[PDB]
Design an enzyme around this catalytic site. Structure first.
Site, short mmCIF file in Angstrom:
data_model
loop_
_atom_site.label_atom_id
_atom_site.label_comp_id
_atom_site.label_asym_id
_atom_site.label_seq_id
_atom_site.Cartn_x
_atom_site.Cartn_y
_atom_site.Cartn_z
N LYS A 44 0.88 -1.22 0.00
CA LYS A 44 0.00 0.00 0.00
C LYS A 44 0.89 1.24 0.00
CE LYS A 44 -3.10 3.06 0.76
NZ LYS A 44 -4.20 3.25 -0.30
N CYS A 131 -1.74 10.07 -6.58
CA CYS A 131 -2.92 9.95 -5.67
C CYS A 131 -3.88 11.10 -5.98
CB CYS A 131 -2.38 10.01 -4.27
SG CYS A 131 -3.76 9.91 -3.03
#
Ligand SMILES: Cc1cc2nc3c(=O)[nH]c(=O)nc-3n(C[C@H](O)[C@H](O)[C@H](O)COP(=O)(O)O)c2cc1C
Ligand SMILES: Cc1cc2nc3c(=O)[nH]c(=O)nc-3n(C[C@H](O)[C@H](O)[C@H](O)COP(=O)(O)O)c2cc1C
Ligand SMILES: O=C(O)c1[nH]c(=O)[nH]c(=O)c1F
Ligand SMILES: O=C(O)c1[nH]c(=O)[nH]c(=O)c1F
Lengths: 313, 313
Positions: A44, A131
């Site tokens: 992650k 992101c």
């Protein structure tokens, strides 16, 4: 037939891996991805300190894909670095560690500590410049000057080969400028195309409501919505970065979708939404299906068709 | 229960219209759109001179939507101006004329000539700042300084209310800067979100080939792929341009899809790919299905629910 790569001074059983963020946040998740039949796994995206992420509900899936505004919930870089240094079994498959600092300084602080563990264990950095879900922090690789500063500072602090997780682009001039920026950095050895398609909005007709809580419903899209966008970005960077590897991500549910990514230029193929929905069994089905398409066509190696999409005329 | 709208000093029987480019290039196409049950129609984006467009095949459709690189094939501005001036029956429904010059100068040349016909007949301009398919001409509204120049020059030369067809954006910073540029221009009375999602790439697995000939297969996406992207942009500009109208376009196949657009803030709802595939009979179906949803929810008019998407918390 068997599915063999030697990329980035590592050996891979097959080209499949999870997409960063999916099945890879906790030690349990990483042990599950390691026990699966994927060819590799990635952690992650992490930050220096642990994060709880954005409020729930923050992920929803639908027949055509998913929307998410997770907000980089993660156990913190110290945990992912310990997993890479002390816990991962590299005899099973290679590991990539994704980092997504909220500033260039935060990325530089993490890569300075990653570098000794890369030297000792061979973990591979995927630097996330895409992101789309932290409030007030726009996708870094949509600002080409910010992208250049991040890649300069990370290349100088890290000093080792790494890759970059790219946002999707939609304009030919942007493909030209983004790939030229990447080609300034010889340490960038792979380019992962794509992260989620940012800031989409799913609305439920019956309840007349958005389906996720953060940012008034706006989140990144994955899954079937985004396959032809993912293929375009894979191919655009494969054409423009001939001395780098391109990793494909976006819209893979089947061995045929993986075949199309590899025909567009992908070396590895990452699986997000469909892995989140089906679980880690998907990797045996995607390898079976890719092998069956190769056998029907008479292909014996991935190299025979990688990047060989045909154009008309 | 009522689908009527009164905006821009015109009355519309219902919110549906074609999306620019679909069923609107020839006189026959415009008479067919006029004969349909749509509430309005828009002409194919035009240039000063007639254009043949990009080489064929240049449009393909699939179960999840379409890809196109038509290349602004059109009969030239003189034709669409004569249709607006002499041929269109304004007693049947309002007409929008879309213009897509390849430079600011070309747009200005056309709006100087359109202005007297707009004053006399009430044709409404849609300025296209988002074509993703002419080689070497990136979408104008992805360059905010170019977008401001075009809007300044067109506002000064035209002098009348007009609207703008916008590309999709994927970044909150871009939504904020784009709407701020539009809000500098009081003559921009409506904003149409979205044009196709640019430079996707559809590949046929069997033939291992791209499916359209221009630009090595890269073309704009429409249809099911793009509905959450279209809904995000409709809502983003609805919330950021409270003194303008937003027209929704992208992914509409059903009355439910139109309902979601209108919840997100749409006034008119334009139909591209699904009208190209189904033909003009789709307008009676979308009308029936939207009135069925309104009846089940107790809504009597569109303004009872336009913009009323709920967020969580
Ligand atoms: C729940 C979820 C979490 C994700 N977290 C990350 C992340 O930590 N880092 C990242 O680079 N991408 C992240 N992504 C994006 C995925 O890696 C992938 O780029 C995107 O989902 C597109 O692939 P897909 O169509 O297979 O879902 C995440 C996606 C999802 C659905
Ligand atoms: C064949 C075709 C031609 C198009 N030509 C134009 C055009 O001339 N001007 C324009 O503003 N958009 C053009 N578009 C974009 C559509 O107006 C619409 O914005 C896009 O297709 C998304 O809507 P959809 O999901 O309903 O297809 C075209 C789209 C298609 C499929
Ligand atoms: O944590 C998330 O929200 C997340 N989701 C994404 O789709 N991409 C990311 O890069 C990311 F960090
Ligand atoms: O003619 C085209 O290629 C065309 N196709 C589109 O999808 N949008 C346009 O604005 C356009 F002019």
């Amino acid at each position: 037939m068997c599915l063999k790569l030697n990329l980035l001074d590592h050996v891979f059983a097959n080209p499949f891996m999870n997409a960063a963020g999916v099945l890879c946040s906790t030690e349990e998740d990483l042990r599950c991805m390691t026990a699966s039949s994927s060819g590799a796994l990635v952690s992650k995206s992490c930050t220096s300190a642990p994060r709880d992420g954005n409020p729930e509900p923050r992920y929803m899936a639908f027949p055509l894909g998913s929307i998410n505004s997770m907000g980089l919930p993660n156990l913190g870089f110290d945990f992912y670095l310990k997993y890479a240094s002390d816990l991962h079994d590299y005899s099973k498959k290679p590991l990539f560690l994704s980092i997504s600092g909220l500033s260039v300084e935060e990325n530089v602080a993490m890569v300075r500590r990653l570098a000794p563990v890369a030297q000792e264990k061979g973990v591979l950095l995927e630097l996330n410049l895409s992101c789309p879900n932290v409030p007030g922090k726009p996708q870094v690789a949509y600002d080409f000057e910010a992208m250049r500063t991040y890649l300069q500072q990370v290349s100088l602090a890290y000093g080792l080969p790494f890759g970059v997780k790219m946002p999707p682009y939609f304009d030919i001039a942007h493909f030209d400028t983004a790939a030229a920026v990447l080609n300034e950095f010889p340490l960038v050895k792979f380019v992962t195309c794509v992260n989620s398609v940012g800031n989409g909005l799913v609305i439920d007709a019956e309840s007349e409501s958005v389906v996720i809580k953060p940012k008034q419903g706006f989140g990144g899209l994955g899954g079937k919505y985004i396959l032809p966008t993912a293929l375009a970005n894979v191919n655009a960077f494969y054409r423009r970065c001939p001395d780098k590897l391109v990793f494909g991500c976006g819209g893979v549910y089947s061995g045929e979708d993986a075949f199309l990514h590899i025909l567009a230029g992908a070396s590895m193929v990452q699986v997000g939404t469909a892995l989140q929905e089906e679980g880690p069994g998907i990797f045996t089905r995607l390898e079976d299906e890719l092998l069956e398409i190769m056998a029907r066509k008479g292909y014996r190696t991935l190299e025979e068709f990688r990047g060989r999409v045909k154009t008309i005329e």
